[PDB]
């Protein structure tokens, strides 16, 4: 939008896909189609006004790989296009014509931004710095000169847009995907620029994450087929520091092994094991006692040590015991258990009929709960590689939930287990509590690592609509829930807690939120 010069009369220029521009004037309270510009031949990919004194210049970042600049003013030489507009019984005449044709890019031009005006201590200068962006990784800040009828280009350092600072010292742009680039000019040289740190994320959606036992770094995995590690940075602000691997297929399972070792699950019938390379370890210990955008992907790779098979289909869940002795995994109709050092089968269970959903190692390493998709659960008892004879189980009737279970968790002293399902039912276990319904579909559930001397057990419940309410149920209750600001917009995926308050919020909004509560509360 724009106003007519030296008045409030509003005027609009619109660029359609028909390779020409249209203009509209709000005279008689109504915008009237006044003129059209039959310039280049492509889709219009942006228009920008610039009020220079009495006149108004126009920028057009065209898809035609060209830039054309006209200018409106007031009324051998060419034929300019002019008209008269009504303004309180005054027919004011305005004339427009082409000013310049600039062309320095190869692919389509996406965005242009004038230098915004600002104050030199109350002095409103009118600079003419201009910014351009195109597909082929090319930044050109065009500028005229004292006699440069064709504007003179400048430093071509360098994805649909590049934004510009108020003064112009800063400058930023986004990559084609994921991360983004941030440059700042340096005083020493007018042709000097330095990249600057910027935050990032999985930008598609995260499915799993973990808390390190030491408590200074968390690893997350998303559908972007990436893996990221986050740690606080000093000078405190947390920052992603490493991307240990990039995988061809999607990743949806994750488990921890040791101080630098972990296992991930993907869209294959294979299990992979990674350990931190030394260089990363020393670089990290140096920081704890600022990686950039591009250096990361070059030097954040990890080695692979194992390669496991056996499941007839793609893996769907994974977990490891606290004592770091055995692990559980299941594809989409059998259970396979792996020794840590041997990396071989220990016992195989084929008990359920439908797809497995979630496992739970007993915290005291005395049981192993299994919740599946067939509305039934199973429990297996380790004997005095002890076998895991089924201690107890449920049929299609003894099961309490009427729909598919989704989450399960133990007690801090392994006394009782707790299950949530899509039917918005909450239960406590034999069962020793009433249905703690919340009216919303349950997606995740977790418990405090330690219990109050009041014995008032507290529980975090992640619902299916981004809402995150919390409850409490001592042996025989709402305490606090998330704010509107502190609420996701999609289903929760995992709610892990700090261990030695804090916890983790792994939403489906490809956002990783961390929330602290009062230690006393």
């Amino acid at each position: 939008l724009s106003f007519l010069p030296n008045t409030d009369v509003p005027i609009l220029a619109c660029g359609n896909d028909d390779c020409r521009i249209h203009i509209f004037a709000q005279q008689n309270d109504q915008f009237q189609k006044v003129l059209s510009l039959c310039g280049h031949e492509d889709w219009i990919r942006g228009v920008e006004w610039a009020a220079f004194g009495r006149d108004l210049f126009l920028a057009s970042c065209s898809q035609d790989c060209l830039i054309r600049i006209w200018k409106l003013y007031i009324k051998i030489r060419l034929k300019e296009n002019t008209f008269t507009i009504e303004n309180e019984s005054v027919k004011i005449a305005f004339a427009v014509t082409l000013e310049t044709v600039l062309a320095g890019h190869e692919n389509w031009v996406n965005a242009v931004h004038w230098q915004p005006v600002f104050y030199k201590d109350g002095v409103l200068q009118q600079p003419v710095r201009l910014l351009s962006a195109s597909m082929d990784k090319t930044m050109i800040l065009w500028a005229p000169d004292e006699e440069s009828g064709v504007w003179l280009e400048q430093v071509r350092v360098g994805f649909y847009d590049c934004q510009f600072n108020e003064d112009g010292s800063m400058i930023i742009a986004h990559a084609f995907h994921g991360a983004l680039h941030l440059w700042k000019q340096n005083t020493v040289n007018p042709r000097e620029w330095t990249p600057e740190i910027v935050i990032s994320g999985h930008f598609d959606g995260v499915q799993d994450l973990v808390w390190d036992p030491e408590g200074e770094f968390i690893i997350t995995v998303g559908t972007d087929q990436t893996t990221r590690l986050f740690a606080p940075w000093k000078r405190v602000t947390w920052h992603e520091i490493a991307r240990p691997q990039i995988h061809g297929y999607d990743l949806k399972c994750l488990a921890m092994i040791n101080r630098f070792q972990f296992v991930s699950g993907a869209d294959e019938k294979v299990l992979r094991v990674f350990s931190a390379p030394r260089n990363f370890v020393e670089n990290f210990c140096a920081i704890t006692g600022p990686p950039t955008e591009d250096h990361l992907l070059q030097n954040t790779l990890w080695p692979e040590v194992q390669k496991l098979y056996g499941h007839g289909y793609e893996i769907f869940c994974v977990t490891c015991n606290s004592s770091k002795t055995l692990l559980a995994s299941a594809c989409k109709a059998a259970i396979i258990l792996w020794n840590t050092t041997s990396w071989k089968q220990v016992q195989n269970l084929v008990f359920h009929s439908l797809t497995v959903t979630q496992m739970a190692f007993s915290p005291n390493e005395k049981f192993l709960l299994a919740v599946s998709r067939d509305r039934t659960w199973s429990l297996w008892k380790k004997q005095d590689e002890p076998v895991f004879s089924l201690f107890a189980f449920t049929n299609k009737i003894t099961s309490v939930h009427s729909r598919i279970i989704w989450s399960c968790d133990w007690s801090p002293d392994s006394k009782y287990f707790f299950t949530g399902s899509r039917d918005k039912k909450v239960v406590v276990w034999g069962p020793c509590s009433s249905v703690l319904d919340v009216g919303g579909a349950v997606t995740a559930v977790s418990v405090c690592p330690v219990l109050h001397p009041s014995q008032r057990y507290v529980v975090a419940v992640g619902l299916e609509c981004g809402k995150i309410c919390l409850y409490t149920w001592k042996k025989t209750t709402h305490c606090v829930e998330t704010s509107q600001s502190q609420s996701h917009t999609l289903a929760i995926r995992k709610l892990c807690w700090k261990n030695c308050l804090h916890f983790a919020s792994c939403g489906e909004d490809h956002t990783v939120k961390i929330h602290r509560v009062n230690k006393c509360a």
Binding site: D42, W43, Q225, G248
Partner: protein, 538 residues
């Protein structure tokens, strides 16, 4: 450094050739290449790719006519782009662990990354591997690489690789298709329909897609689904004309279902290309000859597109052990040459052959023929026998000129018709008979009494496809001499309309079209209806 020395030679060549252009002087590229290489102490010739890699645009505008490389990539008339799907599993395995007795490594067959019926060493395969099977990345990379050779991309088409496509979750395929369409449109979308509407007004001017399938997924539901994608041609895989062979090959279906699939698809209005599989177990040479003759003698099949793939025993399959047990034997190369030569003498004129032989890497096949080139050997053999073939690809202007340099002199019309799957097919063409060189073609028929699309109910004749061969001409450009904008299509349209009005005795003409091509028919007063362009006949 030598590199800057070759760069200086390149610049010298550039200035010499632009100077020649300014006064319209004609110069041999190789001559100046040799002279510049000698005068600068070069031991090796300069590559033409780097020669194209430095022309300034105000000269690339007009220097490409003397600079394009491998012109045959556009000697047909339409650019071709191939894409790769994500690896997956074929459906039949639901019964047993059998993909196909002769099929190569699949998702889990001793290959790190591969695809069913694909080793993983094809250039397309490495392109997909680098792209991580992402559609948008690989299509942009490939079109950029093609444009590097100074080739117009005014008209483009898409072919999809992959084992099976119909057998995939729907949301994934919708995501895939919208990504493809956004690749050319450049407009981010949210569903299929938004991408369709936007690509309607794009300038890349996409003209269609073709997909492979198998007769199990050939019911009218899937056909209607594909109608929503703008697909034009299909791949089935016939492998035989004898039912017993199917169970012998553990194919897992009947040739009948193939026949009704052909009939139904032809009624709908798609095109179809078959796959033929010579030298199979329990098949004599005379069996092959008889079945290949049957493939055209029977009005049951009379297909449109043909592809041939000779048997290739490969490690991993059951056939590998069968031959290894010394129980499945191939032919001598001379036998294969004779077989192919005889086959080529039998192809009906309307049918067009697209490819011969597989592209598998050499050091893997236990019976792979030495010759990567076979069409040439067959041509030599059929010269020896003094009998000629009449394939479409071998009588279009592009190939005929590029291989024999023969100029059409007297082009006229030709009409023919036959019966296939109960249809009253009809074939029209402009071509020069004396050199048997062809320029333009059209395929039009009457719809069957039984149909799936009610829009065709009564007084409806469908025009399956229309095309003029040659080379790419930008939609704004009119005459680089050549034969692609002389108004030829207009005559074919009006004559086909007249025939349908009188001889067919119908009342309304419908036609399938590419997403962009619709605008073309708008110039003739054709209006849209569903996914079909249509014109009233009264």
């Amino acid at each position: 450094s030598p590199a800057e020395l070759m760069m200086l030679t390149i610049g010298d060549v550039i200035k010499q050739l632009i100077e020649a252009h300014e006064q319209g002087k004609d110069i041999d590229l190789n001559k100046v290449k040799t002279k510049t290489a000698a005068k600068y102490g070069l031991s090796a010739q300069p590559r033409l790719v780097d020669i194209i890699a430095a022309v300034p645009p105000q000269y690339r505008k007009v220097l490409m006519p003397k600079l394009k490389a491998k012109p045959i990539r556009t000697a047909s008339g339409i650019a071709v782009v191939a894409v790769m799907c994500k690896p997956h599993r074929c459906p039949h395995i639901s019964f047993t662990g059998n993909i196909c007795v002769y099929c190569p490594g699949g998702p889990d067959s001793d290959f790190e990354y591969s695809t069913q019926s694909y080793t993983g060493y094809e250039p397309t395969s490495m392109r997909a591997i680098r792209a991580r099977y992402d559609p948008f990345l690989q299509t942009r990379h490939r079109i950029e690489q093609l444009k590097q050779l100074g080739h117009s991309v005014d008209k483009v088409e898409f072919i999809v690789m992959g084992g099976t496509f119909m057998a995939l979750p729907e949301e994934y395929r919708d995501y895939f298709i919208r990504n493809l369409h956004d690749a050319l449109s450049g407009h981010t979308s949210n569903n299929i329909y938004e991408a369709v509407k936007y690509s309607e007004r794009s300038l890349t001017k996409c003209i269609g897609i073709t997909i492979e399938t198998r007769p199990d997924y050939c019911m009218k539901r899937h056909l209607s689904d594909m109608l929503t994608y703008g697909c034009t041609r299909l791949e089935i895989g016939v492998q035989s004309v004898y039912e017993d062979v199917a169970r012998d090959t553990n194919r897992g279906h009947t040739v009948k279902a193939v026949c009704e699939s052909f009939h139904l698809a032809k009624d709908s209005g798609f095109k179809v290309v078959a796959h033929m599989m010579p030298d199979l177990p329990n098949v004599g040479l005379e069996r092959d000859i008889e079945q290949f003759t049957e493939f055209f003698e029977n009005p049951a099949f009379r297909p449109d597109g043909l592809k041939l793939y000779p048997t290739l025993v490969i490690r991993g399959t059951g056939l590998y052990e069968l031959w290894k047990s010394g129980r499945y034997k191939s032919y001598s190369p001379s036998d294969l040459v004779e077989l192919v030569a005889r086959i080529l003498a039998l192809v009906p004129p309307w049918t067009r052959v697209y490819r011969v032989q597989r592209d598998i890497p050499m050091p893997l096949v236990s019976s792979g023929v030495e010759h990567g080139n076979l069409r040439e050997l067959a041509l030599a053999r059929m010269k020896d026998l003094g009998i000629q073939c009449r394939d479409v690809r071998t009588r279009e202007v592009g190939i005929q000129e590029i291989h024999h340099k023969v100029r059409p002199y007297q082009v006229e019309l030709v009409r023919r018709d036959y019966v296939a799957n109960g249809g009253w097919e009809t074939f029209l063409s402009y071509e020069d008979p004396d050199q048997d060189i062809l320029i333009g073609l059209l395929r039009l028929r009457k719809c069957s009494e039984e149909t799936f699309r009610f829009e065709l109910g009564g007084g409806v004749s469908i025009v399956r496809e229309l095309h003029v061969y040659g080379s790419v001409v930008p939609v704004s450009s009119r005459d680089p001499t050549k034969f692609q904008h002389q108004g030829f299509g207009m005559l074919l349209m009006e004559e086909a309309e007249r025939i349908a009005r009188e001889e067919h005795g119908s009342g309304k003409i419908a036609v399938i079209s590419g997403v962009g091509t619709r605008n073309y028919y708008r110039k003739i007063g054709y209006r849209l209806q569903g996914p079909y362009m249509v014109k009233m006949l009264k």
